[PDB]
Amino acid sequence: SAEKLFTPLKVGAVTAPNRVFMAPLTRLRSIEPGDIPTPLMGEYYRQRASAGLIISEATQISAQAKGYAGAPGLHSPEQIAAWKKITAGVHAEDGRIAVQLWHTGRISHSSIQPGGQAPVSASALNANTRTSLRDENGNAIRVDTTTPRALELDEIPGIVNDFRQAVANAREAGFDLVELHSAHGYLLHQFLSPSSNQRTDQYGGSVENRARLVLEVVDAVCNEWSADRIGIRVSPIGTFQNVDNGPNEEADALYLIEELAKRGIAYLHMSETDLAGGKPYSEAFRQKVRERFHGVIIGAGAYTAEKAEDLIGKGLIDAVAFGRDYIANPDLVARLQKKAELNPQRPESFYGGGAEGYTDYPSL
């Protein structure tokens, strides 16, 4: 039965019937060439339409944004047409779906970049990690990331415009909301972090400069559509894919959050930890965040229904986004409400492949 996890929540322009959200989850099952969403993906999302809100897998705002083979885009006519079918399917089941838009920046490989050139970033520093590509048989594989090229100052407006255009495409595609991916070490986060950003122009140095790009993007997308259609995901505390938030992470996080609140966007999505773990958020920090962002706050990262109820009851967050539990349980809402057991997870099929480990997790 719980208490408040199953009560409606107004999220910007839409109203969620419950606070159990589906976190954005990269599954790398899109069609190549074209990075096109598939009917299988449409079925996967439709099965999970009872979620208070479905946040889609990270989706490219442009071809340059691509960093993983199999990840979908929302920049081409064919992609837009495919996503329209997916959102329609979710809506046919009375659900709501937001598209998470990203630019992977340095977490990419030249072989999947337009023209086969080096990927771009805030500075020319290799991520020193791996990304996922596909072999000749279409199977997912890990490959060391390519050293990026630092974006030139005159190239920045183009990046902002790519986000703006992607949001315009999202609107036509039928998405209820958009979530800017400003977390986990991808492009926006590469600029926010002092460890990945060594620029000496107005986009590097101070936190004001480091947050400049993401805020210009927020302003651009709010103008393109509406602030109440814009959400943003950040992971400002801890280290993510070799991208740490710096020696003043808490302070820098609060600066950004305060700036975001000024735009009156639909929501602030906090990814609290890397899958590898991280220091838990202090109740004091949660309080500081709460008071600086007057909109919906979504908490995520190894959450349990119990933890969600606790923090929601304390008025520190408004909803919770579950990732892996949603991969394995299409009807997670019903299971949590009924206290039913959950299907076991099969990590080996999280990335790539087909229907197995994707649409074959049964509902009650």
Ligand SMILES: Cc1cc2nc3c(=O)[nH]c(=O)nc-3n(C[C@H](O)[C@H](O)[C@H](O)COP(=O)(O)O)c2cc1C
């Ligand atoms: C297979 C998989 C793919 C993910 N891809 C993304 C993604 O596309 N975008 C994102 O912001 N986080 C991504 N995440 C992080 C999840 O949104 C979520 O924050 C994380 O799984 C922790 O929550 P959980 O314990 O409920 O799974 C991914 C995690 C997993 C397990």
